[PDB]
């Protein structure tokens, strides 16, 4: 029958921001004017039980038409310094059909406690993912993942919006 | 010229738990009794400014680092800890290549958070993170180095995550 496949993207948020600095380009400041970036700093993995394999910006998934791809992301610090959140997927036609972002709030998500991690506790945490339906096997040509990027301010306690990016990962469905 | 290098591990928590029970192996229920697992379901990335490459095999990574550099290890499930979840709480071994420190639990008063139902406008709220360091003591490939994590599942109510158990794996880390 039909399954959901997690596609997790680790993002080098620092590299992307510092790249743009040196590249004389600037970061988009509205969700619609997200800066289009390479897939140089985009590292995908999956839980695909049907099997899968991965260069950066690329992934090959065994998926049937009717399967759902569920896109998750995080910075290389697991959003504890720089942070990234996906809010949108567009395109993919005819291979993928994006849905709208799904915000999950676990009222009791597992959380580490100081100063040893264990014993672990629970507390409210919010997460985001965005799904895409597999509509046709092949390499999706025109598929964009959109994410908001954040940095840690000098207080070391608050993360602030740095801007919006989008990238065009190469997703092969097989 | 010393720098901190992030090592992010994505973990297929489901596959690790399934294969363990399909293999008759108990899942460790105490932090000190974590079950040694293969590194088949371990996928590492980095932010290493000096460059890096990711193993044709999972459980491998090659990082450009110098002695005195610090590796900081982070992790999450394939669903970003929103269904199954994972948290590093310990690193052991590594002699003479890596020298682990003890776990650090980061609490951000105002971590960035998505809001329903559009994600944006984002908000902020308290969230906890864990990571653990190892100092680069000698270039080469660490053989005796273990990352330890607590694994969690999402119960039937879909609102609470519960402790499944503890595991440790021995990633192949090449410092070059
Ligand atoms: Ca909920
Ligand atoms: Ca401690
Ligand atoms: Ca995370
Ligand atoms: Ca030590
Ligand atoms: Ca703090
Ligand atoms: Ca919506
Ligand atoms: Cl669209
Ligand atoms: Cl040790």
Automatic annotation (TrEMBL), chain B:
Supply the InterPro entries for this chain: PixA-like_sf, Uncharacterised_PixA/AidA
Which named protein is this? Inclusion body family protein
Q: Name one GO molecular function term.
A: metal ion binding
The entry's keywords? Calcium, Metal-binding
Question: What broad taxonomic lineage does this protein's source fall under?
Answer: Bacteria, Pseudomonadati, Pseudomonadota, Betaproteobacteria, Burkholderiales
Specify the domain of life of the species encoding this protein.
Bacteria
Q: Where does Ca(2+) 3 bind?
A: 107, 159
Q: Which residues bind Ca(2+) 4?
A: 118
Short name of one Pfam family = PixA
Which residues bind Ca(2+) 1 per the record? 80
Say if the entry is tagged with keyword Calcium.
Answer: yes
Please list the residues that bind Ca(2+) 2.
Answer: 99-100
